[model samples]
Target: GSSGSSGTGEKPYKCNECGKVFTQNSHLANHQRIHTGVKPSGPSSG
Candidate 1:
């Protein structure tokens, strides 16, 4: 079976900076921004 898209079906994604468990990688990375001050981006608009 294919893996889930939204989340890991289980909150297993752990954060190395704060020790927080997340259900999704995006959510975890988004949350990491709070501590990393880094935001995810897509292709340039130019």
Candidate 2:
């Protein structure tokens, strides 16, 4: 069976920077940080 577009699927949040589609808003926000350079510097070892 060919994979066809699932009509009426839950609208996804797409990133304008890379045209990436995420099912959740949180995912888009987290991914955008990679390009925006706003990632949290957690547990950085010196």
Q: Specify the highest-lDDT model's number.
A: 2
Which RMSD values do the candidates have, in order? 9.6, 8.8
lDDT of 1 by residue, 1-46 (tens): 6665743334468876777887778999788878854444566453
Each model's backbone clash number: 0, 0
- How does residue 4 of candidate 1 score in lDDT? 53
What TM-score, computed on C-alpha atoms, does each candidate reach? Answer: 0.47, 0.52
Lowest summed lDDT across 10 adjacent residues in model 1 is found at 37-46
Superposed by TM-score, candidate 1 places the C-alpha of residue 27 at a distance from the truth, in angstroms, of 0.7
Q: Residue 25 in model 1: shift from native, Å? A: 1.0
Q: Model 2, 1-46: lDDT tens per residue? A: 7577644334568777777888899999899887775445777553
On TM-score, the leading prediction is 2
